[PDB]
Amino acid sequence: FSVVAFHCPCSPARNYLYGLAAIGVPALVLFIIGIILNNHTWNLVAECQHRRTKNCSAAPTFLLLSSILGRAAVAPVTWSVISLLRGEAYVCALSEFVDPSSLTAREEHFPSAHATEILARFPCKENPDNLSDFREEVSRRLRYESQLFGWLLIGVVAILVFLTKCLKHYCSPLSYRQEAYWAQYRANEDQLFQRTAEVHSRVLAANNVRRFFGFVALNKDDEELIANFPVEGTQPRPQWNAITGVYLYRENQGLPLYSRLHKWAQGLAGDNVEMALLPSALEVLF
Amino acid sequence: FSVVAFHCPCSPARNYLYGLAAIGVPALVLFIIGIILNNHTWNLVAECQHRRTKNCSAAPTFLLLSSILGRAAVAPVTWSVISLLRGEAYVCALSEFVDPSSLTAREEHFPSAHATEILARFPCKENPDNLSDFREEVSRRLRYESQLFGWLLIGVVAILVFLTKCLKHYCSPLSYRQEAYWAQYRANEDQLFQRTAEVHSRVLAANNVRRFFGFVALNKDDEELIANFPVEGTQPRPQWNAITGVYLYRENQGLPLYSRLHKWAQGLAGDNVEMALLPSALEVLF
Amino acid sequence: FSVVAFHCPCSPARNYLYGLAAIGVPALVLFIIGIILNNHTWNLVAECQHRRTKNCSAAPTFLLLSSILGRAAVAPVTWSVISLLRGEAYVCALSEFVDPSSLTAREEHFPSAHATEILARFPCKENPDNLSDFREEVSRRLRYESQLFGWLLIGVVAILVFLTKCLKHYCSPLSYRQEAYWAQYRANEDQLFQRTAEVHSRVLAANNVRRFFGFVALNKDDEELIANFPVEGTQPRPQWNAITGVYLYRENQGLPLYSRLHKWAQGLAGDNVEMALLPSALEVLF
Amino acid sequence: FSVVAFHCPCSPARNYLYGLAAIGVPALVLFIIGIILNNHTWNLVAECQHRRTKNCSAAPTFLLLSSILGRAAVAPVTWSVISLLRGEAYVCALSEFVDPSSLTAREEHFPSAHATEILARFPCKENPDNLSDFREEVSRRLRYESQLFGWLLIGVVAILVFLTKCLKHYCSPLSYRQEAYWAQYRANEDQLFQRTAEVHSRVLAANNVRRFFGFVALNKDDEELIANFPVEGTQPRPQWNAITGVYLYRENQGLPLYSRLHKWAQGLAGDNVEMALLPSALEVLF
Amino acid sequence: QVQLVESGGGSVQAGGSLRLSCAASGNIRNISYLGWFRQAPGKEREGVAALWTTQGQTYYADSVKGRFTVSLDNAKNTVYLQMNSLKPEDTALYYCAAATSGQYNPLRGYHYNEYWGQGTQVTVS
Ligand SMILES: CCCCCCCCCCCC(=O)OC[C@H](COP(=O)(O)OCC[N+](C)(C)C)OC(=O)CCCCCCCCCCC
Ligand SMILES: CCCCCCCCCCCC(=O)OC[C@H](COP(=O)(O)OCC[N+](C)(C)C)OC(=O)CCCCCCCCCCC
Ligand SMILES: CCCCCCCCCCCC(=O)OC[C@H](COP(=O)(O)OCC[N+](C)(C)C)OC(=O)CCCCCCCCCCC
Ligand SMILES: CCCCCCCCCCCC(=O)OC[C@H](COP(=O)(O)OCC[N+](C)(C)C)OC(=O)CCCCCCCCCCC
User: Where is the protein situated, by its record's location annotation (chains A, B, C, D)?
Assistant: First the structure.
């Protein structure tokens, strides 16, 4: 934590580069983490992969990209807001650009010999005592600008969060209560699918280990899992493909379908052999 | 918490902008949060969406908008009251506008060279010792005005809260006890509907996961949910639409109806195919 | 708490306005809260609403208004008593009106140049050392007057509370034991009616949610509520109207009736269709 | 912990060697540990061993090597990032290379007698008081460069982690949900295989000890292990060889196979005698 | 806006001939999908035949090829079907359906209009 503490290099053309790096790089890392952790980017990638023909129209891809970027940008925005409200980075970056002519609150004692160097050295307390008033005059100005920018950022972000939702409810063909039900269903489906995938994988692995050694060393909960849930085989690759991708609220016979797993279960999702272990049986014969 | 601490930029034409930003932006954010969290704005939006013809009259829309804004404005009003009673923001904003002629409580030692700059620099303790009395003379004045405004705001808000309720009970066609019963019913209906929506979504997701894997890994409470509450299908989109929107106390056969869910359940709410998954069966045949 | 701390603006014609605001506004807010929280003002409003003809005589309306105002004024009176006994507000308000001629306890060192300004600046410790005795001479006087007023207020309030009750028992047609029984009955009726209204609303909402989803997700206590208390319908609007309003001890066949709910239950309270959902069945046919 | 504390040798051509050693050697050790602990390098080695003919193509070997190196390089990268952000190692290494001409923030008091020696002696506080400003001028510069490099490293690493995953999901023939299921299966298979190997080895050892002494001193859990899981013999060497190596998602009859243990269990993995204890029975006869 | 009136149901033994008629009343200009469907208890609904007013071609189910035919009277704006070589498998509820194209926007899905009419056709033996 003390490692990432801000340390302004008081040098012209050098402090703003350090501020830019030390502020943007954490923001970029947070943006990357937000992109990676989201599962909508991955099924968007899966759609672009399996479609392989640019079949999807511009509107749905644009909507998904906007949603992913908006969900990811929360952490960079709040990090930037905190950094701006702190004021250290902005004063460090903009100390060297302060105009000596515009300086006030003291008689004109500011030298013009090396103006940029002294202005850049202000943040590190390396201010001559004869310019003790000027240093504070700049410190209260640049920090003010920093905090002003932070507050404007919070205002703009709040306005965007208000407007985006006000348009999302207005342009959606569904009611907001039905969309809340849909969100609840999506959360429950994701959690249940993950849990059952874990259990199914454990049971299959136990069967394989039993085939190898002749028995399995299982715990009591694992024994209950094996007894209650028996597995006969593995789901085919097309069955997995039928449930991976983006879904936009299709309706069948007046009844809503809330995911492509639901659509597949209803039966609305389901010659050439690929990535086979061995050749056709005719070739195996020879 | 220390990040949002007030820091007055002692500069003319610059401190009041900072005060305005640092006070209004939190107020705007609180107003936006109050608008978003309320569910009356969303069913108002749903009404404006599904009606799509400006069918609703001016009076009900005005009443709903007034109610939403009044409920949302509670947090901005108390934030502004606290900020005004603190006095820091107001003195910072209005230091530069103090008239030097009106200054008193000391002999006329106030320079007229740069009056605005010294007046604006008063808050940051950067007051010359020869003007030590003037600084306090301004500090006790502007802060007084701030606190006076805060107390007037509390008085006006209290008067409005009294008058609005006194008119709401006077102009309502119902008695206050019946309206209390109606509010209790609305709260209970909302909570029960949310809980049952969660349970129904969980059961449907469990059915889909069972269809996929052949079993579901459920907890004991989830097992009780599945056993007690079985689901056969999903409610249609028009059934959801029939319960989303604004409702204003209709009465059927002399019996009150307290929500459009109640009205739908009584049977008073219920050719062209939209957003279908696949074409008509005739087109599916080809 | 430190926000509402008193801060006297030591300026003529300015400190008494601040004291008046900072004392009256909390008193006004407490008075408004006392008016709002009481349920007698609301059924008085309901009476004035449903009667809609000024039918009620002057005596009962005057008695109810007196009771409501007397119950509400408890908090403003004690707040004013505490503020007066503190003495800060009164000395701040009346410092500028102290007569310099009446000042004593020191030789006549008080200047007549700006008498009002120094007198008003006394509270903020901004008293010249040559007038150090005068400042205390005023501080012990004005504070004394403040505390005297506070004690007179407590005496008058106590006398009024004694006299009002002594007249209430004297002029009432009932005995004091019967009135105590009546008060106990009113409290029990209010609590039981609120509890049963909550339970009835919950059961009705559960029925509606069951009609929507096909089941309700209820807790064990909610399950007990549903099993024990079944609801068949909603009470009509006139049934609610028959129990809302003011009641003044009518007697039926020599037997007391203690509320209009009791009077309605005894059967002594119970063509044109208003606020209907749909037109008459004849109009519905077309 | 205090042993590995950094101690800069303030000497030319000597401090950067110490920094290089004290930074790289921990990084090299962490890289070696990451390589060793991973089990993918070992089955890659097993593949290169048993194939013994360079049979595997360049693409799969390259992919496995890339995966192993990427998983191993996490610890060296974060160690280097922390060391760079600390700044001590970089300033110690680059103190002697600072150009005296480029030095600023002070009048030209820097001697040219032994420039390199004083520059190298800067980190150990052995700076003459006449050069007290120069020492800080260098300390704020070199440390800045160190921290800048650290932040650039974090940015590049984050970009690579984003891009690699974005390509891994794009070029994989499987969906991401199926790959998650595959990962869950691999984890469960590894844990179960280790547990059953431990139990099988314990039971075999117990049988051997019983053969030696006539009984085994077993604990209650060991007694349960012996009773529940009996072993008849040891698996042959080719059976072990059939499950050790690298596996790349073959598919049999449209059904996925997730490991070579699974492939062996399905029956798709299974004259000269090697490493025998005694000669052929014909030679044993003589 | 569009109503379909279906008639001709009755009981005919195996090998008989039946003629079922469906008359359309209303806005038939936009209709491009004319066909018949059969559903039986214990099973879903399948289509015996349909025709294209826009393109002209026609589809028959596998069990309908060479056994039953459907014709359209443009002047009458009616649909006639001829059940020939009746079998006991034909005991089912019969409906005539009309659909008006169907336009697919990628964001929302398919939208069109569909119509139906209830009829029956049961063969004794
Ligand atoms: C650490 C958190 C503390 C709290 C502070 C942040 C608030 C979090 C709660 C609300 C967030 C939310 O719900 O945002 C969601 C929306 C996404 O809308 P969409 O992309 O149209 O998707 C449609 C909606 N979906 C996702 C339901 C389908 O985001 C936004 O549009 C704005 C996000 C704010 C940051 C990015 C603003 C633009 C970049 C900056 C320009 C100067
Ligand atoms: C953090 C809280 C601490 C306590 C301090 C605040 C009191 C909260 C409890 C009472 C609130 C309440 O109940 O307000 C409710 C009413 C809404 O009335 P309506 O819009 O006509 O709707 C009719 C009533 N309904 C909602 C039951 C249908 O609000 C008001 O009319 C005034 C709200 C005060 C803030 C806005 C005043 C105007 C803006 C400022 C102008 C200078
Ligand atoms: C925080 C509390 C701490 C304790 C201090 C206060 C005592 C509280 C307990 C007794 C109160 C009580 O019971 O008051 C009740 C009576 C109401 O009488 P009524 O209006 O004729 O109604 C008849 C009686 N009912 C209500 C049973 C039907 O009030 C009074 O008449 C006086 C209230 C005192 C404040 C207002 C006085 C006038 C304004 C000031 C003028 C200078
Ligand atoms: C102590 C940890 C704290 C957190 C900080 C580190 C993040 C850890 C979580 C993500 C790691 C991860 O998942 O990395 C995994 C990938 C491996 O990708 P691949 O080799 O193509 O294999 C394909 C993916 N597999 C393994 C699933 C099959 O790594 C990388 O490509 C980058 C690793 C970063 C360090 C090396 C970068 C290059 C060297 C430096 C050049 C200047």
Answer: Cell membrane
Question: With an 8 Å Cβ cutoff, are A60 and E109 in contact?
Answer: no
Best of B272, B284, B285 to substitute, by most chain E Cβ atoms within 10 angstroms, is: B285
Q: How far is B244 from chain E (nearest CA, A)?
A: 21
Q: Which structural technique was applied?
A: cryo-EM
Q: How far apart are CA A227 and CA B215, in angstroms?
A: 12
**Is D77 near ligand 4, meaning CB less than 6 Å away?**
yes
C-beta separation of B3 from A85 below 8 A: yes
> Hey, CA dihedral for B125, B127, B132, B136, is it positive or negative?
negative
3-class DSSP assignment, residue E72? strand
Residues A175, A178, A180, A186, CA torsion sign: negative
Radius of gyration in angstroms for the set of CA atoms belonging to chain D, rounded to a whole number:
30
**Residue A276 DSSP label:** B
The neighbouring-strand residues paired with E18 are E83
| Angle between helix A15-37 and helix D132-171 axes, rounded to 10 deg | 20
- Of residues A252, D286, B170, B121, the one with CA closest to residue C50: B170
Burial of B75 (0-12, 13-18, 19+ CB in 10 A): middle
Residue D5 carries which side chain, given as an amino acid letter? A
Phi, psi of B255 (to 5 degrees): -115, 130
CA distance A265 to B231: 15
Size of interface B-C (CB pairs under 8 A): 183
Q: At what angle are helices C15-37 and C74-86 packed, to 10 degrees?
A: 150
Name chain E's partners: 3 or more CB pairs within 8 A.
A, B
Alpha-carbon span C31 to C69, nearest angstrom: 9
Cα distance between residue A121 and residue D105, in whole Å: 8
Residues 6+ apart with CB under 8 A from E81: E19, E20, E36, E48, E49, E68, E69, E70, E71
Q: Which residues are bridge partners to B136 per DSSP?
A: none
Quick check: D94 and D84 in contact, CB under 8 A?
no
Q: Which amino acid is at C55?
A: N
Alpha carbons C26 and C20: distance in angstroms, whole number: 10
Q: Are C142 and C110 in contact (CB under 8 A)?
A: no
Pairing of strands D251-252, E45-52: unpaired
C162 Rama class: left (phi>0) / alpha (psi -120 to 50) / beta: alpha
User: In the numeric block, which tokens belong to residue C132?
Assistant: 């150090």
The structure was resolved to a resolution in Å of 3.1
Tokens linked to C263? 């009077």
Cα of C154 from ligand 3 centre, angstroms = 12
Distance from CA of A286 to the nearest CA of B (A): 37
Ligand 4 site-directed mutation target among D160, D162, D170, D249, most atoms within 8 Å of CB: D160
- In this structure, the number of other CB atoms found within 10 A of the CB of residue A150 comes to 24
| Residue contact E35–B285, C-beta within 8 A | yes
**Per the structure block, which two tokens stand in for B206?**
């469990």
User: What is the Å distance from ligand 4's center to D70 Cα?
Assistant: 5
CA angle A230, A236, A237 (to 5 degrees): 135
- In this structure, the residues whose C-beta lies within 6 A of any atom of ligand 3 are C 66-67, 70-71, 73-74, 77-78, 156-157, 160-161, 164, 168
How many helical (H) and strand (E) elements, i.e. helices and strands, does chain D have?
12, 2
Query: Under 8 Å CB-to-CB from D109, ≥6 apart: which residues?
Result: D130, D131, D134
Chains A and E form CB pairs within 8 A to the count of 14
Tokens of D1: 């912990």
